[PDB]
């Protein structure tokens, strides 16, 4: 099964395959680069996640970071269960050396289109995954 999300690590002998990748080791020091993932189906049976070679912020995916406001307004750390509003989310974690894989599994429809973010840091480098999951038309 493919993971809809971002691989920020530089490793190829992994057991997890990601739809997207952004090698954080190649981002400039003090930079904050996005990796954007968009899911759009009437019903899901999907794995969503990231592979981070350093610190993950917040405690993804049980907690996630709200999307960016268009107004000058804060984005808070929230529980994913209440953010996407489905009660049977499955959470998974794995580690391959210094790489940390955090995933969640979603089955069925989502009541409303939602977005959220997870941040990955490695030394002075940082990258963040933004996810959007659409509700049925």
């Amino acid at each position, epitope marked *: 099964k493919v993971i809809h999300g971002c691989n920020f690590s530089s490793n190829v002998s992994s057991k997890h395959t990601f739809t997207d990748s952004l090698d954080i080791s190649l981002v400039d020091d*003090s*930079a*904050h*680069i*996005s990796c954007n993932v968009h899911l759009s189906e009437p019903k899901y049976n999907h794995l969503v996640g990231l592979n981070c070679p350093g*610190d993950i*912020i*917040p405690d993804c995916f049980f907690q996630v*970071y709200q999307p*960016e406001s*268009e*107004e*000058l*307004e*804060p*984005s*808070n*750390i*929230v529980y994913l269960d209440s953010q996407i509003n489905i009660g049977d989310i499955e959470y998974y974690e794995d580690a391959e050396g210094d790489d940390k894989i955090k995933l969640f599994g979603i089955v069925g429809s989502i009541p409303k289109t939602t977005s959220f*973010t997870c*941040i990955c*840091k490695k*030394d*002075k480098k*940082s*990258a*963040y995954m933004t996810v959007t999951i659409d509700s049925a038309p």
Partner: antibody
Framework: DVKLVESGGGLVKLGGSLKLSCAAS????????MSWVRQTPEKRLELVAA????????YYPDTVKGRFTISRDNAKNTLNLQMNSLKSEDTALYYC?????????????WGQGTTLTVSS | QIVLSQSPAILSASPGEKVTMTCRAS?????IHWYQQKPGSSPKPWIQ???SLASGVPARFSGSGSGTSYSLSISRVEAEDAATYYC?????????FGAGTKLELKR
């Protein structure tokens, strides 16, 4: 290296006006939110004004709203603070500092500050 | 409007001691950032998003918390840790800081 250099501070009479400026270098200025954060003589830190990456959205706390205006020029890499009807309580060291949506709005770089003294 | 109350105002310590300073919020906040300031310079990033150390910050520092109570700990104080530590929230406008805890060396 990321650098933020404030200028424009000085002595202003009560009710006076003054413009502060911050020169940013060593990073993509237009990707970051920018703020003016002041440090009072009692060492309290207070946000004065915040502006988003493109300059379309701003925020001011009620202590300076209407009196202060923050703006940025993404062609020149500069941040400005226009301060009107200055009060004695506005006397502080004013720092220029950045945040990113993608770093959870963490002030990861600050300038050395420019001093404002409001007195007649 | 959200008030961050830092205690103690002055944390007296000898090098080698294990210490903790607290940041209590008047209402719930979803994270706290910490900054370190020494006389003559601006505040520096210290702890990002409650518990992630900023680049270059030694492993003896840690941060923890949730809701209305957060903290910063030093497992073994060093003389260079004498500084003021500020906590900061941005769960609602306006973004606010605590008044700081000044880590002071005993004699």
């Amino acid at each position: 290296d990321v650098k933020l250099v404030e200028s424009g501070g000085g002595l202003v009479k009560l009710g006076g006006s003054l413009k502060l400026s911050c020169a940013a270098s060593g990073f993509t200025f237009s990707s970051y939110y920018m703020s003016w954060v002041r440090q009072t003589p009692e060492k309290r830190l207070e946000l004065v004004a915040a502006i988003n990456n493109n300059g379309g959205s701003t925020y001011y706390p009620d202590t300076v709203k209407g009196r202060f205006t923050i703006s940025r020029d993404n062609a020149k890499n500069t941040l400005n603070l226009q301060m009107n009807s200055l009060k004695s309580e506005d006397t502080a060291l004013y720092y220029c500092t950045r945040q990113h949506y993608g770093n959870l709005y963490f002030f990861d770089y600050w300038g050395q500050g420019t001093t404002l003294t409001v007195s007649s | 409007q959200i008030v961050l109350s830092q205690s103690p105002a002055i944390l007296s310590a000898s090098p080698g001691e294990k210490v903790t300073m607290t940041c209590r919020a008047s209402s719930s906040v979803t994270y706290i950032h910490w900054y370190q300031q020494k006389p003559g310079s601006s505040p520096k990033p210290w702890i990002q998003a409650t518990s992630s150390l900023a680049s270059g910050v030694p492993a003896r520092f840690s941060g923890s918390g949730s809701g209305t109570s957060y903290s910063l700990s030093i497992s073994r104080v060093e003389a260079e840790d004498a500084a003021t530590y500020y906590c900061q929230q941005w769960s609602s406008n306006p973004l606010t800081f605590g008044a700081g805890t000044k880590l002071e060396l005993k004699r």
